[PDB]
Paper text:
Transfer RNA–guanine transglycosylase (Tgt, EC 2.4.2.29) catalyses the exchange of a specific guanine base in tRNA molecules by a substituted 7-deazaguanine. Bacterial Tgt functions as a homodimer in which the protomer consists of a (βα)8 barrel harbouring a Zn2+ binding subdomain close to the C-terminus. The reaction follows a ping-pong mechanism including a covalent Tgt⋅tRNA intermediate. Hence, in an attempt to generate a model system for the active site of human Tgt and to gain insights into the relevance of particular amino acids for substrate base selectivity, we adapted the Z. mobilis Tgt active site by site-directed mutagenesis in order to mimic that of the human enzyme.
In order to investigate the importance of Gly232 and Val161 in human Tgt for queuine recognition, we created a doubly mutated variant of the Z. mobilis enzyme in which the corresponding Val233 and Cys158 were exchanged by glycine and valine, respectively. To allow the interpretation of the obtained data at a structural level, we determined the crystal structures of the mutated Tgt variants created in this study in their apo-forms as well as in complex with preQ1 and queuine. The crystal structures of Tgt(Cys158Val) and Tgt(Cys158Val/Val233Gly), each in complex with preQ1, reveal, compared to the corresponding apo-forms, a shift of Val158 towards the ligand. In contrast, this side chain is excellently defined in the electron density maps of apo- and preQ1-bound Tgt(Cys158Val) and Tgt(Cys158Val/Val233Gly).
Numbering used by the authors:
A (entry chain A), B (entry chain A): 11 to 127, 129 to 383
The structure:
């Protein structure tokens, strides 16, 4: 396999299905990436993550740089070796969690300094973020950008997008200057601009001029609501280069994924299925359920009637109800495995339906049942 | 397979190795039984418990009767079906945890009434305990006894042992009157008498007159220290019928197990490897380690150099150190799997060494290294 190659096998409207080939493996798109925080997908061995159908996982740079430390992970042989996942890993830049979780935050054109949420002092910059992602041994490296809050005024969205594009060029140059990283990993840029079409366009043009292996739509899933998110995707995704993957960062709920694929998105991540699995929320084709509800206490059916996962093969709603109510670790294990398996089955249905030219019908059928 | 048959294949001094055959499976002795509290061996799927080598698990009646409830479990098809473990299960009587965890405790010759640790009111008696164990679908049912605290005066140890023997007869009669239980499960009696040889003898004689499928040594591992425990086993175990299994309740540390087998014990349980696994304590042939210690932060070796478990095949001390320090669920999963696998490897070495007439040498070699 090559360092990076994205092939599109089939299309339907704006939707695409295909493959990303990388040295560590093939990624089927559209793809869902389970989130590994601190070098673990919560409550799952890597073999179980793979058994659910995942081709790639996401690792959080911020958490890793705090515990166990990026230099330490590099000394120990890299993130893949450390956690026992040998397939591709996409790392985020660390910037988002600096803003959402850290304490200091002195921001500047150079980057950000901050206090860990033991109050030790740390720094991130385009250069240091790219370096940390190298030390982790990331396969897909995210450019370091500045968070644009929602809502944002046009002036502030513009200023922040402009800074992010300067940081995208610095990220590109840092990545390219490190021969081992340039030859073995891929680099994605992040489109900014809040909800403003003109700023989204300027951002896409700047990122395409620099040139990346893939393009994320940043700044969404931050409070805006689905209608607004879809409205922004409607004009934003077509601005990105068609022949590279489009990654919607932090999305999301099953219905958000379906609509985003309808709008040209190829890659997804979110904590939702893992975090909400822990935590009683289980996804089903008839919509989510909360397994803690008393109505499930004697329900012998599996979490979902059709799901092919090992949890649905082997245990009842009644048992999982009991485990989650009792605070048992096995409850978190089982809920997380089922929810990430459900997400992968959703992605497989999306891929097959695009391949077969019946994705619009699938989306309609999916929604009719999920919201019945 | 029969309802119950204990065969002794080989002996060395007081030590024995053999098999218990029951309808749901064969148990190799000496046996270690991982403890399932509330219908789960903490942080492990039943398939993983089996992969470590366990032939039988213990279920805690007290916890089960509170959550999810014994009648509910029976409605749902029994404990085996509910939790997904199809091999034998030994249930305790519930009495111990009434004393250690519950709030009310009004004790009488009839039994005990108590408040749950939501303050709902419950009762246990020989008859109700046997009934609850039936409703759970237990394969090995423990007679309901009275807890003798350590230390105990001779008068109080005698009074309590005498009550326990009256309750042993009531347990026997309750079990025998329920045809389905009598035909499919086994019943063990519990020897009492604190540290007093004469009381231990009276207790053994009373239990043998009633007649049980197996005999537990109760009332130890309660604060007495290893020398005293071994001193009591020295005279107590030979009092029990030789041709039935001898079960030392609540023991214990690897060295306690080796010495107890030297003294004629065939069956063991304890929370130690699971609870202490969570929790940073890992067993090794060179003695226990605490994986949280900073000295392990960059240690690429497995938990134990010889252990054949999947954790030692796949992950380093450094990774598990990180997970436990970070409070990650996967840390509990990995530590628990390794510790229960270590216990099963200990039992296998004990069985093979007795079978080969070299158990005394094994015990000496084991101690020399474990305490080096
Ligand atoms: Zn499932
Ligand atoms: Zn091991």
């Amino acid at each position: 396999r090559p360092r990076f190659s994205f092939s599109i096998a089939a299309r339907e409207g704006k939707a695409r299905t295909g493959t990303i080939e990388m040295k560590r493996g093939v990624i089927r798109t559209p793809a869902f990436m389970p989130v590994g925080t601190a070098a673990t997908v919560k409550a799952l061995k890597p073999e179980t993550v793979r058994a659910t159908g995942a081709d790639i996982i996401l690792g959080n740079t911020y958490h890793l740089m705090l515990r166990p430390g990026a230099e330490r992970i590099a000394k120990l042989g890299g993130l893949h070796s450390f956690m026992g996942w040998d397939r591709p890993i996409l790392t985020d830049s660390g910037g988002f969690q600096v803003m959402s979780l850290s304490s200091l935050t002195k921001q500047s054109e150079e980057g950000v300094t901050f206090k860990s949420h033991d109050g030790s002092r740390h720094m991130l910059s385009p250069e240091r973020s790219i370096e940390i992602q190298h030390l982790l041994g990331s396969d897909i490296v995210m450019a370091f950008d500045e968070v644009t809050p929602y809502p944002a005024t046009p002036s502030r969205a513009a200023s922040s997008m402009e800074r992010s594009m300067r940081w995208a060029k610095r990220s590109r140059d840092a990545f390219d200057s490190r021969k081992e990283q340039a030859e073995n990993a891929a680099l994605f840029g992040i489109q900014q601009g809040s909800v403003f079409e003109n700023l989204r366009q300027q951002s896409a043009d700047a990122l395409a001029e620099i040139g990346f292996d893939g393009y994320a739509v940043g700044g969404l899933a931050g409070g805006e609501g689905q209608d607004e998110m879809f409205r922004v995707l409607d004009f934003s995704v077509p601005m990105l280069p068609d022949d590279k993957p489009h990654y919607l960062m932090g999305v999301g709920k099953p219905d958000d994924i379906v609509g985003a694929v309808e709008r040209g998105i190829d890659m997804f991540d979110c904590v939702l299925p893992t975090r909400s699995g822990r935590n009683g929320q289980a996804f089903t084709w008839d919509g989510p359920i909360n397994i803690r509800n008393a109505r499930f206490s004697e329900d012998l059916k599996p979490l979902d009637s059709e799901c092919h996962c090992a949890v649905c093969q082997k245990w009842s709603r009644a048992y999982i109800h009991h485990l989650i109510r009792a605070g048992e670790i096995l409850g978190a294990m089982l809920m997380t495995e089922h929810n990430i398996a459900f997400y992968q089955q959703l992605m497989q249905k999306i891929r097959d339906s695009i391949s077969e030219g019946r994705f619009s019908q699938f989306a309609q059928d999916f929604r009719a049942r999920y919201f019945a």
